[PDB]
Amino acid sequence: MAFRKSNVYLSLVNSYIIDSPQPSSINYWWNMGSLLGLCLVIQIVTGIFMAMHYSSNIELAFSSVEHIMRDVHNGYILRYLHANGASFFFMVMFMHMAKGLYYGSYRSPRVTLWNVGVIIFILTIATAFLGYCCVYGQMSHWGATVITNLFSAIPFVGNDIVSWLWGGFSVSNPTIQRFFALHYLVPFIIAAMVIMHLMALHIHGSSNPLGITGNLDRIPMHSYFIFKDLVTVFLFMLILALFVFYSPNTLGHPDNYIPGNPLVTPASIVPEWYLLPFYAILRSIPDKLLGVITMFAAILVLLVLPFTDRSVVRGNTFKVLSKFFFFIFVFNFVLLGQIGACHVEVPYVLMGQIATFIYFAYFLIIVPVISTIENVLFYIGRVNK
Amino acid sequence: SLYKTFFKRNAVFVGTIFAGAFVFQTVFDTAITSWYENHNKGKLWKDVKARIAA
Amino acid sequence: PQSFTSIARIGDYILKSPVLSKLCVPVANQFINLAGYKKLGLKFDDLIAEENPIMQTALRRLPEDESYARAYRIIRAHQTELTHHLLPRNEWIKAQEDVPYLLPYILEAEAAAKEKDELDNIEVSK
Amino acid sequence: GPPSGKTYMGWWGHMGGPKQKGITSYAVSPYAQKPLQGIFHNAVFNSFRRFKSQFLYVLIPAGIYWYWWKNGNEYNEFLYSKAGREELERVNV
Amino acid sequence: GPPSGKTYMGWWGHMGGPKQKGITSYAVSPYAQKPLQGIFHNAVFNSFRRFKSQFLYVLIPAGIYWYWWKNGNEYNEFLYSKAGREELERVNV
Amino acid sequence: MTAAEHGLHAPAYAWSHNGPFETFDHASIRRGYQVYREVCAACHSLDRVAWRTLVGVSHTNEEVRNMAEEFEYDDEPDEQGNPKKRPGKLSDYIPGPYPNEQAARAANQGALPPDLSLIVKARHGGCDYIFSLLTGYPDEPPAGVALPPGSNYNPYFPGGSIAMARVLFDDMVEYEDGTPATTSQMAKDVTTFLNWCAEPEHDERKRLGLKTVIILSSLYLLSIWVKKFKWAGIKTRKFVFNPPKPRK
Amino acid sequence: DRVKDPQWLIMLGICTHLGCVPIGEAGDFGGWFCPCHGSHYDISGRIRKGPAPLNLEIPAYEFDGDKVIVG
Ligand SMILES: CCCCCCCCCCCCCCCCCC(=O)OC[C@H](COP(=O)(O)OCCN)OC(=O)CCCCCCCCCCCCC
Ligand code: HEC
Ligand code: HEC
Ligand code: HEC
Ligand SMILES: COc1c(O)c(C)c(C/C=C(\C)CC/C=C(\C)CC/C=C(/C)CC/C=C(\C)CC/C=C(\C)CCC=C(C)C)c(O)c1OC
Ligand SMILES: CCCCCCCCCCCCCCC(=O)O[C@H](COC(=O)CCCCCCCCCCCC)COP(=O)(O)O
Ligand SMILES: CCCCCCCCCCCCCCCCCC(=O)O[C@H](COC(=O)CCCCCC)COP(=O)(O)OCCN
Ligand SMILES: CCCCCCCCCCCCCC(=O)O[C@H](COC(=O)CCCCCCCCCCC)COP(=O)(O)O
Ligand code: FES
After folding, report:
1. Chain D residue with minimal CA distance to C60?
2. CB A68, CB A50: distance < 8 Å
3. Is F164 annotated as a binding residue?
4. Tell me, what DSSP letter sits at residue G47?
5. Residue nearest to atom 20 of ligand 3 (CA)
6. For chain E, which residues lie within 8 Å of any Cβ of chain A, measuring from their own Cβ?
7. In principle, which of A175, D51, F45, G16 could form an S-S bond with G54, CB 3.0–4.6 Å?
């Protein structure tokens, strides 16, 4: 046989990116996976070449970031690529998970793939939070303080857990040093989970935007989806180059260029832009413990998703009401982000509570009821009696 | 067949790619530097150095 | 995960009642022709996901000619979705051709699996 | 190597679909094919078809949530002004 | 999955050795077997057999290199002493 | 919050360095440094700006050297361990007027004057906010506002009450080039200078952005062509189906 | 219940609403005044007027003679 098939190392390269049978009807929404892989490689390479100049002391963190942006040759390129690419990493990941919810890729036989995806999502949120605290600006310090006090809400144990996390009594030098070590560490766990994700994908192949089988008309990976992914790679690099070179500090928060001061609290403490729906979910609950439980349940309710989709056809392509309520859900998630960006003021508390309820109601009540009604409507539309 | 022997061997094909990329880097760098200085005439530092003659 | 016996029971309860049928059969076929699976040249039994062993059984049950027709409808649907067009109006699946052809094979596999599970969990008449 | 479980995708030759017969393909080489002949008239009329069949499912949720956000933001900037400070007093307590 | 090349180890059932016939195994359960019955007399006589057949291939290179290292180290600490300083002068130049 | 705690919205001034192609006005940066040194530098440190960054940007080599040699820095101690001073050089940083935080809070009624190395990048609005902050002091606060004594009013500061004094008056500095140095002129010059101090890469960032956007747009269109090319065998593929003989 | 010695007031600066720093010898009540949202604080460290929900926390401190250890 061929050398790409008989060699031990090149057989994986073959069976994953050369001769992988892909369904020939998949559109550009089946390209966000390759795009996330490229953006992860961007994050790791800029992280290494920018962490060769970073000193993680609490008295030397912000000065070393400014040393990167001023004294290091092309260091502004590195930091701006790194922060804005983390923003694009979460945006492409949100689009990828929306592709997962829409076309029904969570359903059987792809439950393992969906669960490893949710694990990757949790690890990526953790990585972004740790790296945002490594800047040690104003928002970095106070966001670390608020999230660890949320961990202090745990009954009978929590204060000692938080003194363990801090490595002291408040967010201090051991906290920033261990956040830098963990933040260097967790992306390699993300890379291992990505390899496990690709294995759980490869044992059944991709889905298709129709929700029927794709075993009939398969076309290879090579040259076809290689050049289709090359198209979206160049578009992604174009938009990233715009938001790096022409308007770099748009997505960030301007308070993060104030150095970390434990005495001055800011006027409005807000995380970076993508953690705002989860921050709104947590802020909508009038309790600390139930708030933390609801914030983690807002990700575990993605795990309870394949067991509630009672639709007998895969994906929302050929269904009306499920497609409508899907876009209700997407614009609700955007409204959660925008509620979280605001203050704790009338009527944003009541709207945050209603928006959290519509989030959990979509994942727990709306999907099974609308899928059951859509099944019975498909049946009685064509069966006569 | 007039140009296909210029494309037939892959060696001369990638040699053309690398020679043209070398020429493109040089010419494109010089041209974008010249246009970016021409668009902002009167604001760069050599203009102020020429104006402030003291 | 609807267990076709259940949807068949609900649909037959709707169809056998005159008031419910007169109320929600126009809503039903309005939902069908807004769904737009006809326009890709498909039938609804071509659209049920077949990656569970009971539906895989009901596809082994199927006669040959209907299996080749189903394979052609799937390949023309993939090609039409690939070109991002629709099939011309002469090639759309009409309302009379949208026959529930695979439903009885699915229902007999449902009854077989249900009976196997019941007999696998019986008591004894003491 | 060990055997593995039954998957729903095989490989080239034993892919696992149903047996098919009498279905013939026809394709032409792209060297004798003109690419992007279908960009003009296509990016107008097909794009309008793809917009018309598919916009309203996006436009009604955007309309609902944007109207609800706008009404909430207007009520915010009302009751933190001088005109609605007594209403802020009675709904904040 | 794709096929791979011919290896020299299969799996349980098709391992790839030669066909074998008329060769019978006999093994007893370790619950009815006494472990470490063969430590005493074994760690003396078998260990002396394993040392006797196998020591000299280790002992001759160790002897050669240790004698050569010792002669070199003795010559070092000779010529950096007071007695051999003129020899250090003539061999360092 | 009301609009008073949030502060008034700074408007959209048409700077000479907005837009994706316009660079800084380096004569304005030179005049902004002059207004900095003669007004701000009594009370604002500039701790992250080295002297060498001004060479070739707003001043020549000898000008930066003769401005840095007016200041004293800590030399390495002599052969008896006594601490000694030295005049500045190109590799040092611009020194602040205050030796520590407590001297700053003592000399400014408790309020700490923030370091202005990143102050146009650490405020929302940015350039417009700094300019409207400087030129925004009313002659007298609006009727009904009780200022705490020692504080001043301008609506652009969040809360209304700022601890700065109005420190831009008509012709308090003289310009080297003879530009009429009104308040708005000096405020525009220092805001351009602080934009340089926060973003010294700004010129090279925009020209490398021009190169990168041109090359990636060309690559994106070329890749669209090659994708439409190599998929042409699959877009135009056709299937006919005559149903087979049912006897088999 | 707030002090062990009425001669001395030693209180934490972590404010209950947002953690702001009140001004020493300021306000209308003779004690402290939060400049963030007007949480008026008395001479003993309690909220009277303002959105602060609870009173100011006293740290743990024990007497040792001519000093006080804090912790
Ligand atoms: C914690 C869990 C995380 C959950 C994340 C929730 C979502 C976060 C936001 C991500 C936005 C991504 C939305 C993408 C939606 C899924 C992709 C999709 O559904 O597109 C296909 C859809 C219908 O196409 P069909 O496949 O049905 O074609 C039928 C052919 N006969 O085509 C369409 O209907 C139109 C597609 C229009 C896309 C517009 C994107 C809108 C983005 C909203 C941003 C709002 C900013 C104001
Ligand atoms: C050393 C390896 C390294 C890796 C790998 C890495 N980063 Fe970072 N990241 C850093 C460093 C160092 C910083 C702090 C310096 C900075 O912010 O410029 C940082 C900062 C960040 C920031 C804050 C940027 C800012 O300035 O506000 C975010 C957000 C972030 N990382 C996200 C990610 C994500 C998401 C990934 C991958 C999934 C990732 N990082 C991988 C090194 C790394
Ligand atoms: C929680 C959801 C989820 C997350 C998060 C997620 N994935 Fe996926 N991924 C999927 C699903 C579902 C599929 C299968 C697509 C389908 O339904 O056919 C998939 C498929 C893929 C594919 C195959 C190409 C494609 O578009 O399907 C790649 C590659 C991939 N994922 C990479 C990643 C990478 C890289 C990450 C982050 C590092 C990631 N995924 C995170 C759910 C997720
Ligand atoms: C009178 C002493 C004094 C002088 C002179 C002075 N400053 Fe300030 N400045 C301050 C103080 C004090 C603050 C902070 C006050 C506060 O936080 O309430 C300040 C704050 C600022 C701020 C930011 C204020 C904020 O709310 O973020 C800017 C910008 C600023 N100064 C610019 C300048 C510039 C430019 C000059 C020279 C042109 C200058 N200042 C000269 C005392 C001074
Ligand atoms: C379903 O069909 C598929 C499909 O099957 C596959 C496989 C893919 C492809 C998937 C991917 C490409 C994702 C793969 C991602 C990874 C394997 C993550 C690995 C990432 C890394 C960054 C590897 C780690 C390497 C390093 C850290 C090396 C960096 C070291 C440096 C820079 C050292 C520098 C120092 C000096 C001194 C030079 C698809 O996109 C796809 O859809 C079409
Ligand atoms: C690990 C990082 C993952 C990133 C995801 C990237 C997905 C797309 C990868 C594209 C690889 C293209 C190889 C195609 C090929 O070799 O075909 C080869 C030859 O094709 C070419 O020469 C393509 C021209 C050169 C394109 C160079 C693109 C480099 C920019 C890559 C930017 C992303 C790294 C085989 O082509 P053929 O079988 O049709 O004859
Ligand atoms: C957690 C997994 C992380 C990723 C690992 C899996 C993916 C690995 C992909 C590797 C792709 C690149 C490998 C191609 C190299 C092929 C050369 C080869 O196989 O020839 C090998 C010899 O290889 C070497 O000597 C060193 C290879 C080290 C590779 C270092 C990267 C010979 O192989 P073979 O026995 O089939 O040849 C018989 C001759 N006719
Ligand atoms: C290692 C992964 C890095 C991927 C970066 C993608 C993000 C896009 C922004 C890139 C800007 C950084 C480069 C730059 O500033 O160049 C600028 C020019 O812009 C470009 O050419 C970028 C084009 C990107 C093409 C990507 C090719 C793929 C290479 C894969 C790695 C071998 C500066 O050019 P100059 O220093 O003057 O030579
Ligand atoms: S801190 Fe805002 S009221 Fe006490």
Report:
1. D18
2. yes
3. yes
4. E
5. A33
6. 1-5
7. G16
